[PDB]
Amino acid sequence: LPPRPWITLKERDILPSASFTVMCYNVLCDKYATRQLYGYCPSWALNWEYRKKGIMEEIVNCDADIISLQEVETEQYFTLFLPALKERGYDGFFSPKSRAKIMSEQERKHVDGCAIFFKTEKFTLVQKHTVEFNQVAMANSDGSEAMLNRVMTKDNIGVAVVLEVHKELFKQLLIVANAHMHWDPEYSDVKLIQTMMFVSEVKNILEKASIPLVLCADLNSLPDSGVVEYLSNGGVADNHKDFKELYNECLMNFSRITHGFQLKSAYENNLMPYTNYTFDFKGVIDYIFYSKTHMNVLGVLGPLDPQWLVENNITGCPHPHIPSDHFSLLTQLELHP
Template sequence: MPPPHREWITVENDTSEDDQDKFTVLCYNILCEKYATSQVYGYTPSWALNWDYRKELIISEVLNYNADIVCLQEVAMKQYEEALGDAFKDRGDYDGVFFPKSRAKTMADKERRAVDGCAIFYKASKYDLIEHHLLEYNQKALQRPDFKASDDIYNRVMTKDNVAVMIVLENKETLARVLVVNSHIHWDPHDADVKLVQVGMLMDELDKFASKHLKPPTTSPHGPTYASTTQLPTIICGDFNSLPDSGVYEFLSKSTIRQDHADFGNYMYGNYTTEGLSHKLSLKSTYSSVGELDITNYTPGFKGTLDYIWYTNNTLDVMSLLGGVNQEYLDKVVGFPNPHFPSDHIPIMAEVRLKSPRREKNEEPNFGFNSRR
């Protein structure tokens, strides 16, 4: 039997009837069609592993949650351009931004369309897209002089073609802006060093991108001005392939990590392994206040939390969270995907509220968000 619906967890009781400053974010690794093979997922009935079946479950699941912002990983270019993209735009009022992994640039058209990447969808009636940006980790590593002297960069980081997508959205009514990031970090559990390096580059690039959007765009000159990149509301979604006790989680949540952290191993990565890593943002995982979910990825070989929605807790408050999957149900199934769950990951979702930003004198008050929920 299918499990009971996942319950919502209230984190902060909201007595305000004004929804202008709320929005919802969904994060979901949907398991790309080409990775969903019977060799890997032999416990899944072939009909439940078939993309046509899984596709419809994914579409209905995402549309039913009706999030304002949807970050998906492992989206094939073909599916973004066709089934998924069309369904979300036609039936869900979404526009989107998509970039495939770096290997797509070297392929013929047919092969390129099977390459997966990261997509961000947003409610077109609610937001205007101000700018989007692609971070290719292997290409960014080449641009750093301190990395060029490291053999480990060429042997370990350059061979991984993961990407991150960044966008700045502007609320059509309030003109408040939010920076949204979506990434899929390298998967191999033996490569903790690569994950740390990728997330280090992610935070470096995020700061540069954010600094371009502190002042309102020329199209909306009356929007708010943010004093620094730390004041721009920021959401970072992704499959980080990292557990809560990992260096990646420590770095994001504590803003710093030592140059000799165990996850770096004996590898050398320029300033990262001589000075350590740091970033400017005050980040928290949305689920950290109630405890991370027991699982976001569930297979016979692995059960644990790999997916996160990070937020700047000085600019945003978490109001509620989508709870986990019923434990009695989990105890009865071998793993995902299965007839009820179309991916080996489950979606995670948070409702957040924008705090009042710092304002210049004489600035109009309340640059919040308007939610249709």
């Protein structure tokens, strides 16, 4: 296993500014780490008792100031992620999917969700928020049968925290948001709508709290998609093909459909060839977006050496040496007040 290379994009700055790093990582929850989907990885290496060590080691060694995780299993949050990262100087916020859904005690422990951790020496938690996409869809369906049938029926969520950035690093506020969108490629419309919902709800948090945004997400969307275009260009045509020409009027409950932020992906221009890496599918579907008005990217952690993967005949993850089917993103950012 060779070290992943750091890529410098700009060096540190004279003007007073704070730099900090952000990790975005889908850990692959145990529930979904099955032989069926991951036949090519041996059982002992899929198993959570084994994989959780590689996943902790990954998060520890990245050592980011802000960590956004997806597929964090409820019980693992409280008994593993939080108490171990507390020992490293972090506090955290977590919310599970499916909160409103009836299920046994046992099943409730295994439901996964999104978590944001932050170094308490650098940041103070001002507010925490959960955005349940099923609920925002319900509230915004009026008319539109697609909303209710296609969107409200997906249990996805994002979380967001409002953080106070300690003055000494330079009340400076920062919002960090983390989401995990629906997966199914036949549902490009749900992915885009969940993103519009997440962004507009994030804007609302912002009002009630101009203020820098860091947006981490497993978007399940390629760089060419309607969702990436929407996030990167401040908006998208209400007739974009990703709507499956299937919405209109209800779309602009979150509003050519537009958002106010000015965002760039930390890894734009293909700095990694894929963030999800399996036998059947490899592509960039995970992202760290930041407000380009307040922040520059100083650098990113580059991809694992493609030559190393080929030499070891690794055509999909997880693998004995790679504990998730996603690779972590890690970026260093510089914030100007």
